[PDB]
C-alpha cells in the first residue's frame, strides 16, 4: 500500500528553487547528507548512554557510501536513530517550513545555496544532483518505511518489506544523467576529504564491482 502526500507549498517552492537555480557548486550535497548521518548517529548514541538496549538493533555506529554505476545510484547509509512515520509525514515538514522561510530570507541577504544546511533543510540539497530520492529508514519501535520523491509537489510513503535494515537511514540518490561524476571513486574521495574530514564516525567508501 503506497500513500501519496502533497508537500506544503513552501517546501515545493524550496525544491523548485534547488532544481531550477543555476548553481555549479553541487558537490556540497554530500557534505550535507554525511552531516545528517552524523546527527542521526549522535542521537542514537546519546539515547544509548542511559539505555543500552537502544543498541539491540545494532551496536555499530558508522556511515557507508555506496556508488553503483549500473543503477546510477549513490547510496548514503548510516546506523543512526532513523525516522518514524510521524517524522516522514508531519515532523520534518514542520521543521522544513520555518527553515525554508529563513533560508529564503538569507538568500535575499546575499547567502548562497551551499549554506542550506544551516537552516535544517540540508537534506533537500540532494535535488542538486538527483532526479529521484528514495529513503529507507528504521527507528526503534516503529516499522521500516520507504519514502520517495521526484519533487513535482508530492512524495510517497510505504511500509517497506524489502531487506530489513535493523536501524538507521539509507538515502538512495538516483542521479541526474549529467551528474554521474559522483559515482567515481576519485571524485567521492576528494569531496569527503575536502568537506567531511572531521566526522566522528567511520565513513567507508565502497568500491564498485
Ligand atoms: N527537513 C528535513 N526533511 C528531511 C527528510 C525528509 N523530508 C521529507 C519528509 O516528508 C524525508 C526523508 F526521507 C529524510 C529526511 N531527512 C532529513 C534530515 C533529518 C533532519 C532532522 C531529523 C531527521 C532527519 O529525523 C529526525 O530529525 N530531513 N530534514
UniProtKB/Swiss-Prot annotation:
One of its GO terms (molecular function) is protein phosphatase binding. Changing residue 32 to A: Strong ATP-binding. Strong interaction with HSF1, HIF1A, ERBB2, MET, KEAP1 and RHOBTB2. No effect on interaction with TSC1. GO terms for cellular component: apical plasma membrane; axonal growth cone; basolateral plasma membrane; brush border membrane; cell surface; cytoplasm; cytosol; dendritic growth cone. Residues 1-209 are annotated as: Interaction with NR3C1. Its main location: nucleus. It is found in: Nucleus; Cytoplasm; Melanosome; Cell membrane. Keywords: Acetylation, ATP-binding, Cell membrane, Chaperone, Cytoplasm, Host-virus interaction, Hydrolase, Membrane, Mitochondrion, Nucleotide-binding, Nucleus, Phosphoprotein, S-nitrosylation, Stress response, Ubl conjugation. The keyword Hydrolase applies. Belongs to the heat shock protein 90 family. This is Heat shock protein HSP 90-alpha. It comes from Homo sapiens. The lineage of its organism: Eukaryota, Metazoa, Chordata, Craniata, Vertebrata. The gene is HSP90AA1.
Amino acid at each position: 500500500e503506497v500513500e501519496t502526500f502533497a508537500f506544503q507549498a513552501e517546501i515545493a517552492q524550496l525544491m523548485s528553487l534547488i532544481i531550477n537555480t543555476f548553481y555549479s557548486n553541487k558537490e556540497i550535497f554530500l557534505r550535507e547528507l554525511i552531516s545528517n548521518s552524523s546527527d542521526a548517529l549522535d542521537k542514537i548514541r546519546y539515547e544509548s548512554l542511559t539505555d543500552p538496549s537502544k543498541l539491540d538493533s545494532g551496536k555499530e555506529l558508522h556511515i557507508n557510501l555506496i556508488p553503483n554505476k549500473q543503477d546510477r545510484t549513490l547510496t548514503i547509509v548510516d546506523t543512526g536513530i532513523g525516522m518514524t512515520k510521524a517524522d516522514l509525514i508531519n515532523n520534518l515538514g514542520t521543521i522544513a517550513k520555518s527553515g525554508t522561510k529563513a533560508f529564503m530570507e538569507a538568500l535575499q541577504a546575499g547567502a548562497d545555496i551551499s549554506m542550506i544546511g544551516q537552516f535544517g533543510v540540508g537534506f533537500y540539497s540532494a535535488y542538486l544532483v538527483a532526479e529521484k530520492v528514495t529513503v529507507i529508514t528504521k527507528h526503534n519501535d516503529d516499522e521500516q518505511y520507504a519514502w520517495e520523491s521526484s519533487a513535482g509537489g508530492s512524495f510517497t510513503v510505504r511500509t517497506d518489506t524489502g531487506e530489513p535494515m535493523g536501524r538507521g537511514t539509507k538515502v538512495i540518490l538516483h542521479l541526474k544523467e549529467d551528474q554521474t561524476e559522483y559515482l567515481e571513486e576519485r571524485r567521492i574521495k576528494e569531496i569527503v576529504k575536502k568537506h567531511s574530514q572531521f566526522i566522528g564516525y567511520p565513513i567507508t567508501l565502497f568500491v564498485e564491482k
